[PDB]
Symmetry: D3
Subunit: 267 residues, 6 copies
Amino acid sequence: VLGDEIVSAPIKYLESLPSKGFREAIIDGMNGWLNLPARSVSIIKDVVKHIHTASLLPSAHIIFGVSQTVNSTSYLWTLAIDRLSELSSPKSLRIFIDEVRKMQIGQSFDLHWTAALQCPSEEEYLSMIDMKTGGLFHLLIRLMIAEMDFSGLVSMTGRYFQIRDDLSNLTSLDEGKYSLPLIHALKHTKNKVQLESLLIQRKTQGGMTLEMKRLAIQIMKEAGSLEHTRKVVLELQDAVHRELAKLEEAFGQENYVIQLALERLRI
Amino acid sequence: VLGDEIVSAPIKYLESLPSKGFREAIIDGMNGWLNLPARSVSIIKDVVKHIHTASLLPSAHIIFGVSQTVNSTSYLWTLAIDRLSELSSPKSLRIFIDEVRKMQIGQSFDLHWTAALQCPSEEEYLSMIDMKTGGLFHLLIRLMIAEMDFSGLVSMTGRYFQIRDDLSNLTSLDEGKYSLPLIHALKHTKNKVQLESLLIQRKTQGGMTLEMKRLAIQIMKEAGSLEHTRKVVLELQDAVHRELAKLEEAFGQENYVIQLALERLRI
Amino acid sequence: VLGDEIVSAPIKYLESLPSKGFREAIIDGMNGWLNLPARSVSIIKDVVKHIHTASLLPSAHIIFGVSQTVNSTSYLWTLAIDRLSELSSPKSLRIFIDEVRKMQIGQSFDLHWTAALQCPSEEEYLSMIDMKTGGLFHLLIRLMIAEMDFSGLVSMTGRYFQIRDDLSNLTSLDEGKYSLPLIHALKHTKNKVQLESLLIQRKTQGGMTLEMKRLAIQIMKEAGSLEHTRKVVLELQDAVHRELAKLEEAFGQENYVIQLALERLRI
Amino acid sequence: VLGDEIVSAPIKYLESLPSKGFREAIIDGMNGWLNLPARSVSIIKDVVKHIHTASLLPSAHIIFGVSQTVNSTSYLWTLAIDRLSELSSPKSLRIFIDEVRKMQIGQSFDLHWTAALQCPSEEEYLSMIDMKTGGLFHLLIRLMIAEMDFSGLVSMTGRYFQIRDDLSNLTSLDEGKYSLPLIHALKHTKNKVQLESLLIQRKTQGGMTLEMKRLAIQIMKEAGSLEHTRKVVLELQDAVHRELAKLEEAFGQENYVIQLALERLRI
Amino acid sequence: VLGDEIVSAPIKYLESLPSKGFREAIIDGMNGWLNLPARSVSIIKDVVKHIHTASLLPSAHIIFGVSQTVNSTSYLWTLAIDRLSELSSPKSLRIFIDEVRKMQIGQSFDLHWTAALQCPSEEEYLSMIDMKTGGLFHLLIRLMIAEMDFSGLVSMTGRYFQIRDDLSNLTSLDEGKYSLPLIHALKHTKNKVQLESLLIQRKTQGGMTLEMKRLAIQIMKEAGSLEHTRKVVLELQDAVHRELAKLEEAFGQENYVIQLALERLRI
Amino acid sequence: VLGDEIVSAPIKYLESLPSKGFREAIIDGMNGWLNLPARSVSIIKDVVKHIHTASLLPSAHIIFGVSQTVNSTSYLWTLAIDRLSELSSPKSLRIFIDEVRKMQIGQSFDLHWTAALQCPSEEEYLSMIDMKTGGLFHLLIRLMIAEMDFSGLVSMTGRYFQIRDDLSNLTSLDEGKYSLPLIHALKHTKNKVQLESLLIQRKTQGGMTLEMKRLAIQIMKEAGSLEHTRKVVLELQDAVHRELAKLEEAFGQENYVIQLALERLRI
């Protein structure tokens, strides 16, 4: 008899590291608007956690290797679908599979843009982040509804989260991911050749050094990208706050925890 | 609008390479016993092909990289579950998830034994290969029945296939996988230290050279492992042929294509 | 007293390897049209050889290292300018420097396109090869005249030489240079993602394997690129042959050695 | 139309980094003795800067790669010769080419001594540094005169600058260059085998560690090399100061800026 | 004429680094019980130092390379046997060779356990450390006696020294050696798979990082290994102190320097 | 109880590979001149075999690693001294240790010359090979005599063996060892810089390629080194044959097996 002690080790490792439960907060804040049993909420939380963990997969692949990490990712997919199988709604499978399909397509495009050293436009990047990030958000929304319109709020929340994380990473690069400040700088700078060469050498050497990071940040600063993205974040935050109010006026109630979660992520 | 042309590229590469359709032959030979519509057979074939391809995932990761390969593996899981969702039977999901769980557990143990340089016993290795290989076989069987006892035939077929492949690889090592001849040699040889050191150096250097392969093969030959495994294969072949007859006498019919498929893999 | 025995060793190494004297043939065939002393022809030959050798710089950098190769390249530049200083014409320096500037700009663009993994258009590639290849050719022409119009013949000869070399290399890849068949295939193929991934992995691993080369060649063949480039070569050959006639009818003489050199490079 | 935006990027990168204008100070201090128009002084400054930059070529080859750096070095040579072509004197080309030849020969010997792990004598090292360093200095002198005897002052200044830089680097190794303290230590030490092994291992590993650097510095200190080189620096400083006076008494004027530049480099 | 200045350099390098003369203290404290001439004591000290240095052979192999280190190890063996040849006793050779044989067998087993990633039992590890460490100790004892029973004191002293060093290293891993806390943790922990994977990845990558070291130390702490080994050390210290008394009562004298040496290593 | 199964594995591996028993032939041919018991001859053969094997230590370090190989080398030294301890002569230890000391010094010089990239002279190389090779030969001779003058015959035989092996290796490089043809070429060639650069790049890259080997052999051939070494081999062979006769006339007997062994190594 062989048990699930080896395949579940990376899963039990990355599911114990602390994290800010923004998705957990949204789950705990939306069941107030439409009432659901505690078991359904727990099932939805488990499914969302499994999907996010599988998206993530020191790093777990450093401790456990690559092949074991891939096997554990497949096991995570199986666990998530098994947990989803217990829901009462009969259309949960279609929602799950199509949202996961969208997330996977967005992730593939995000990987390909970085690998091929081709910079996307702002519109293409926004569409990609919409897919990749809001797939989980409106999977959550659809699963909760099945067991008003939420597309605009989901899109604004995903964009706000992503570009706010971009500012938190830069203002406060070594992976080569094309963020919004990098996209803006690559089209509004005089040292375009220098920035392109920096990206090419980062790809070649496998990473960037501290001096290269300082030079790239300086080139970004002289282009004014770090202010344009801050203005974008301010606009997105205002859009999210105004989108939440339109939903609050239709249900005849105010969510005092979703607003608290948003205030915990203020600018 | 972003399409599935990047995520599906690795999938469309290994699904075009030719292969011996032994599983396809079994599918085409078992629906003769119990009749099924062509659409159900096509769906089952697609599901089995997707599961096998995901198990597999020049190598595709050489052409497309590692991250893209993992993302395409997740996409393959989603495609397989979506295709399975069209079946008429209501218990297909449970069969699918538990068989895939067994396959993943077996694969995890197979990876861990090679990584940790610990040789399993013959019985434990046989149990592992039963899980890992026959999971797909009796997933196929259960899916066809849902839309007599088959456990013995599945177990014997999986073992026969695996150790026959081991002989085809050896008699006619660079990955470090523990086969049956290696397990027998490691317990019935005088140059145990030399074989252990060869395995350790293969792990350290990332591969084995031609001279090391010749030395390992000669050590195996001097221990008589290559004849013990041939006797095991002969016994397994006889067991499979005698197990098929017991099923043929209960359905009141003879399968002239499963027998042909087995004859195509004679010794 | 320190001599030039170390700096000149890489120079004396590649100046002894045999080569097809197409440029030497052009020099020996055009001075028939306009007569020059033997000393001027020898000086022009030496200058052209030095420039070509500097453009080139087992490989010499394998035997002598990288830094010594760069120092020897600078020594080649100094030797070429010193040899040019002995010419009677007073405008040789301007011709030399502007033609060398054109060659260097073309080489820089050729390097950058390969490094950045960005495919040029056919017009851009043709302009780049015009600069890079015909810079030496019409440097030769201008120096010989100084001591009719030749721009069309020079451009046609440079393009014919370059794409003929491309066909000779392909029909009869590991460096990543964007040739004409590759440019045509990248815009007229169905397996665009596979070809792009092959190029990316070639850049990442530092080279391509035999199986990858076979796959890329087969992808190019399925797109019909290898026939389009052959048609282009035939058109360029006809253009060169018709361009030579217009020059032959203006000088009132026929060159029986330039035609022989072209016939030595027939298709 | 292809421009010089890629080839000139490494040039425009290192021409903006700050540096101590000792050569600029010498140019601005010697034109006081013999008067020249501002345009000639600017041309000489540009030529000297281009030659020094080409000699140099985070590091620019880290940001831009190796091939682009070599192409930009060739572009620097072309730019320097083009700028020199505007001078009124007719013998500027010969001075330029022979001084550049001397510099290149000295650099070749300096590279070969380090590569071959053969320690030069003190006289050979002094001759090499004379060539390599004073080539630029008396190129500057000859170009300025063309548009008294200066050989002794140039030699003394070059030696003083080089060994002063050696002391500034050591007293206040990872490249393997044979300095004066290393040459003295290798012939006046008891741990000769240890020092030779340290140099060999530095060559093999590609660099030296902090502990190896401390051990080498301690071995040098125990041999008294760091005091012998300081005495040499003091003697060279006195020689330079006494050589400047002999020139000041022949022109009937005192240079109050060359003396200031020397005082900025006091011991 | 070729001298021993290259072969003896690593020997003269590692014999000058300071060390705590515990073995020297034991030698100086045991000749008080049985009187010996100063020449014999010096010879025994030299032999013991040579044996220990050969066991050891920045690291000397970093400065001098690998082959030179092996040749110097052989030279150390020759020097030790030559020094031993001057002793008056006729059975010194047999004692020397059999004790060195025991030391080499213990070292071989210690290397093999780490290389093969197989954890020994506590009893087997204790036997291995007995051989490997106490071989030198009771070689020293036998050599001094030849020129009461000491086996128990030697065994207890060797074990106390080894596990005390283990605590000094851990409490106050990158080589993969199996200590006592690691052995206890690997059999009394819940995260067995994580610890095994950490060891496997340490072997694969050639070393461990700071985060991996912290994780391993925390896993050991949660298992209570660091307290079990401290209790073991306390028991061993008490055993050594009680074993010394039994020897002190038979010779009718008290050693005031061996006791001081033990007090210098209190807990 | 831990046995000698791990430490003796490389010893039992390299002592089973076939070899031409030239030293065995000399032992079997010289005991005819002076009669010795079979046990003494067997002991001497075992000691010589152990010393040669320790000198040697696919390669055994490839199969078993480096640390295990060093431990087995130390075990070989212990085994050789233990076997020598059974001889009846009382001065065997001094002969053994001083001859082994000479061999080790010669090996150290041979390693250092290759590591430091410094070419020895012909006389110094001959002295080094005399030490390193004839140490074993006249250790054998002295051991047999203890249980006429043989220095000249031993020296001539060692030189003949070594240069014959070098000539056979070259005429019929990747390790960097300075042979006699290489030493002669480095002082009698025109492409000295090219050969030195080839050696430096061989050291840097860790080995030489086939084209580099062909180039080096061609440079050697153009220098006439391959004929000078053949003349040296012929002279050494004549010297050995004339030295054997002088010994044959003093013992009043002819050795019909030493002459056979020499004839088996004719030119």
